[PDB]
Design a binder for this molecule. Structure first.
Ligand SMILES: COc1cc([C@@H]2c3cc4c(cc3[C@@H](Nc3ccc5[nH]ncc5c3)[C@H]3COC(=O)[C@H]23)OCO4)cc(OC)c1OC
Ligand SMILES: Nc1nc2c(ncn2[C@@H]2O[C@H](COP(=O)(O)OP(=O)(O)OP(=O)(O)O)[C@@H](O)[C@H]2O)c(=O)[nH]1
Ligand SMILES: Nc1nc2c(ncn2[C@@H]2O[C@H](COP(=O)(O)OP(=O)(O)O)[C@@H](O)[C@H]2O)c(=O)[nH]1
Ligand SMILES: [Mg+2]
Ligand SMILES: [Mg+2]
Ligand code: NA
Lengths: 419, 439
């Protein structure tokens, strides 16, 4: 059950690169690909994200319309570990236009990328599906990313499709036209992804600014929370244990209805030598200020929830905490889905933490995020502002209208069940 | 990669392009013979400075540009100037007669002769480029070469290069330095013609630059040399994202944000700090000071009131010893104090970029070297006032059809005049529409 990782665009390539670094450390793989871990656990499911001179190579394909981002990764610490042939980029760049990526200047490279993917999928003994990282509000990963997803779905319609999509935010914005690109991407994902982890570039900032007390968070700061969250969700897949989660089972248990495949990640300790108590981890995990999506769970209701606790800790005390939360917060849990919350414990703790907790929740509150994006789109789209940059590529206002609508429907759906 | 070919039409175009190129050599460590000792790569490379400067086997770093003027005089001084070795003979193109301040003469009667040779030299430069990005055209509205040949070259570039970029550095006519009574005519006409072929147009009012020098540099009667040197500083800040490369942000992203609609492609520019070398001695200018300066109306290149209008975009391109943290503070402060009103359709944010490369001043300059400078570009509807003034002059003379005979004898027709004016009136109404609040 190999997972073909795929990272596109600047943001996608930056966060994906750290994700590899982090999970390589945890799995005791150094930049050269050799292994030096002290426990076999590390090598027991390493094939989920690595392929083996007894060296593990990440099963990752890097994609970009400009060399710069991919060249930095190559120069990065683990730049060696990434397979050179898996590097796949062009020179045109996407000028931050979904169009330029999903239509004009991506249709070229997309084929090249599908070839590497095909090669990775062939070697895979049992292809679990595909993992993708991108920023819904840019050009290559917003637009070209959703294009590759569609292509991928046609070739591999029996595989799980999961995306770590980085929702753009005014607090951390690059261009006025970022809402437009997000709305188009959102609708692509609604239809061609089974699982999407919404990482709001807003929240991350907040967390950093407020909690972590960082006046001028840089993109690295946000990326650091992102890599941690990533390792979290991916733990059960990487490391063996009682619950050997897989993409399909993950979708089967957390997705009551297809369109509703957007999840609010949460992590604690938000970074330290004082290991938190199992009660502490459990209260922070569900803490809004510890969720990477900028939505209040109290404003909606948890369809489904899944927790993981890495590190040595009392399994019983863990179960007790979870039970308490559910019982004290019964109103925030859908009644129609019995037992909608489940927890799992991994012995290997995150890097540099004695113990942590990762939260994955399909809350109706997630609609807040899409409402924000929809309002922005509406603001500009009501006056057709900046639309010429897309109409120049051959797009049509109607297509903007459609995507706008769909994202509103999705918002409605989350509310329906909320009430 | 992403080469930019620089095109300098007219006297103003040419001179302002000699300012710019000198400053760019000084900034990049290029010597007057073109030899850049810093650049270890010889005959080529991928350095940011290669987007504006090509290289040779000898290590000489030739500018990527072409100086065209219908009279030899202006380009001749380049030919014999200090930087004559830097440029290449083909790059300098000069006819024998000027357009005698006549758009008609420069677009048709004369321009047509040299237009094909010009496009020819551009094309050669274009083949050198691995991925040409667009063109930078420098001209003045008031002159016949700066209007008539410049529009002609704009049309030709549209056809021959399709929809490649075409930015502009248009010299708004200033009565203080006015050379022709008919300059409003040429201005309307060229603005009308290139409006459809220019992706992004930066206007510089001689009057505004003349004021800035008298005030901030204490020059009694600023010369075209003063203006040009100040102009080159602005240009250099705008192109600094291209020629130099963590906080630096490509001007494309700014462009995608400073053109809400195709016709609204004239952004206002304000630079800081312009200070004399005495005044700069024993005074340190903070990020906050320079940032205020940007929002100061006397510091703007075009004379207009932003308060009278609304902001549709506001970008801050810094250079030098700047840190994000200070820029965030200064911005907030500004906010607290200023009335930076934004159209409702537009997000009230300030896009920033920090290019740590510090600013440079030409030796014997009146500008003091500073450790930090900033140049804010804003898409405010105030720019219209400009057009108005001009337009109004155009209407005054055109009612009495003055000097109109000079155009007609070259073959132009009054229809062209009226059509051009209509388009300006539409542009002015378009500014008003974009300011209206959404229903
Ligand atoms: C938090 O821990 C995780 C849980 C899951 C989901 C999941 C999601 C849920 C849920 C239960 C389950 C659970 N489902 C399951 C499967 C087989 C079973 N066999 N016998 C019992 C049994 C139960 C996981 C075991 O495999 C999965 O992928 C499943 O309740 C509401 O949301 C995936 C993970 O990866 C990301 C994961 O790591 C973080
Ligand atoms: N800022 C600035 N403006 C200039 C400069 N040189 C000329 N001008 C302006 O340009 C206008 C005249 O334009 P020119 O460049 O001389 O016209 P031309 O391009 O030579 O065309 P011809 O009439 O045929 O010679 C005047 O209104 C001046 O204000 C300059 O060096 N700096
Ligand atoms: N968290 C995070 N967000 C990023 C990063 N880089 C870019 N972004 C966001 O990505 C959006 C722009 O997309 P970009 O990365 O430039 O996409 P591209 O066209 O494919 O390169 C902006 O909202 C930024 O907020 C990053 O490294 N980390
Ligand atoms: Mg980007
Ligand atoms: Mg002349
Ligand atoms: Na192409």
């Amino acid at each position: 059950r190999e997972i073909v990782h795929i990272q596109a665009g600047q943001c996608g390539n930056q966060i994906g690169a750290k994700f590899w670094e982090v999970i390589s450390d945890e799995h005791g793989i150094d930049p050269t690909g050799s292994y030096h871990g002290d426990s076999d656990l590390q090598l027991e499911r390493i094939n989920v994200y690595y392929n083996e001179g007894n060296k593990y190579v990440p099963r990752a394909i890097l994609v970009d319309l400009e060399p710069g981002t991919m060249d930095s990764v190559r120069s990065g610490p683990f730049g060696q570990i990434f397979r050179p042939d898996n590097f796949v980029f062009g020179q045109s760049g996407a000028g931050n236009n979904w169009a330029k990526g999903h239509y004009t200047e991506g249709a070229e490279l997309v084929d090249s990328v599908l070839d590497v993917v095909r090669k990775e999928s062939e070697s895979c003994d049992c292809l679990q599906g595909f993992q993708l990282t991108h920023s819904l509000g840019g050009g290559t990963g917003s637009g070209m990313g959703t294009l590759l997803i569609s292509k991928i779905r046609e070739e591999y319609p029996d595989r799980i499709m999961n995306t770590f999509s980085v929702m753009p935010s005014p607090k951390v914005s690059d261009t006025v036209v970022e809402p437009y690109n997000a709305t188009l991407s959102v609708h692509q994902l609604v239809e061609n992804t089974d699982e999407t982890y919404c990482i709001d570039n807003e929240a991350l900032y907040d967390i950093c600014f407020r909690t972590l007390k960082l006046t001028t968070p840089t993109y690295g700061d946000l990326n650091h929370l992102v890599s941690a969250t990533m390792s979290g969700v991916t733990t059960c897949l990487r490391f063996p244990g009682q619950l050997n989660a897989d993409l399909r089972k993950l979708a089967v248990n957390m997705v009551p209805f297809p369109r509703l495949h957007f999840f609010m990640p949460g992590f604690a300790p938000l970074t330290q030598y004082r290991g938190l108590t199992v009660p502490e981890l459990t209260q922070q995990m569900f803490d809004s200020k510890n969720m990477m999506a900028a939505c209040d769970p109290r404003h909606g209701r948890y369809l489904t929830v899944a927790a993981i606790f890495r590190g040595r800790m009392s399994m019983k005390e863990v179960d007790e905490q979870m039970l308490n939360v559910q019982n004290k917060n019964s109103s925030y849990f859908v009644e129609w889905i019995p037992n909608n919350v489940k927890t799992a414990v991994c012995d290997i703790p995150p890097r540099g933490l004695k113990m942590s907790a990762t939260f994955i929740g399909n809350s109706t509150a997630i609609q807040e995020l899409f409402k924000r994006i929809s309002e922005q789109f509406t603001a500009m789209f009501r006056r057709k502002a900046f639309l010429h940059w897309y109409t120049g590529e051959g797009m049509d206002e109607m297509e903007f209208t459609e995507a706008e609508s769909n994202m509103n429907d999705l918002v409605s759906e989350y509310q329906q069940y909320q009430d | 990669m992403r080469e930019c070919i620089s095109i300098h039409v007219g006297q103003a175009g040419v001179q302002i392009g000699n300012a710019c190129w000198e400053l760019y050599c000084l900034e990049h460590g290029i010597q007057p013979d073109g030899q850049m000792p810093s650049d270890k790569t010889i005959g080529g490379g991928d350095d940011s400075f290669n987007t504006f400067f090509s290289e040779t086997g000898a290590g000489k770093h030739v500018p990527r540009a072409v100086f065209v003027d219908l009279e030899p005089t202006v380009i001749d001084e380049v030919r014999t100037g200090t930087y004559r070795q830097l440029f290449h003979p083909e790059q300098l193109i000069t006819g024998k007669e000027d357009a005698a301040n006549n758009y008609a003469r420069g677009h048709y009667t004369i321009g047509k002769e040299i237009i094909d040779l010009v496009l020819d030299r551009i094309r050669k430069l274009a083949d050198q480029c691995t991925g040409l990005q667009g063109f930078l055209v420098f001209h003045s509205f008031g002159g016949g070469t700066g209007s008539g040949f410049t529009s002609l070259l704009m049309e030709r570039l549209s056809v021959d290069y399709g929809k490649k970029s075409k930015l502009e550095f248009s010299i708004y006519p200033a009565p203080q330095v006015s050379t022709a009574v008919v300059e409003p005519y040429n201005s309307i006409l060229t603005t009308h013609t290139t409006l459809e072929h220019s992706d992004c147009a930066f206007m510089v009012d001689n009057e505004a630059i003349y004021d800035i020098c008298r005030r901030n540099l204490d020059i009694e009667r600023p010369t075209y040399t003063n203006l040009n040197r100040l102009i080159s500083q602005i240009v250099s800040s705008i192109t600094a994202s291209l020629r130099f490369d963590a906080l630096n942000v490509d001007l494309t992203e700014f462009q995608t944000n400073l053109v809400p609609y195709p016709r609204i492609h004239f952004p206002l520019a304000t630079y800081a700090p312009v200070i004399s070398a005495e005044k700069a001695y024993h005074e340190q200018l903070s990020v906050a000071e320079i940032t205020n300066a940007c929002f100061e109306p006397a510091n703007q290149m075009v004379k207009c009131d932003p308060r009278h209008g609304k902001y549709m975009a506001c970008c801050l391109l810094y250079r030098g010893d700047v840190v994000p943290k200070d820029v965030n503070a200064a911005i907030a402060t500004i906010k607290t104090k200023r009335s930076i009103q934004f159209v409702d359709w537009c997000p009230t944010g300030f896009k920033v970029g920090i290019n740590y490369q510090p600013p440079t001043v030409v030796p014997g300059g009146d500008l003091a070297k500073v450790q930090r400078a900033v140049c804010m570009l804003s898409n405010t509807t105030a720019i219209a006032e400009a057009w108005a003034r001009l337009d109004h002059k155009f209407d005054l003379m055109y009612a009495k059809r003055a000097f109109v005979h000079w155009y007609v004898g070259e073959g132009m027709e009054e229809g062209e005049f009226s059509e051009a004016r209509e388009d300006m009136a539409a542009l002015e109404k378009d500014y008003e529409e974009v300011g209206v609040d959404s229903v």
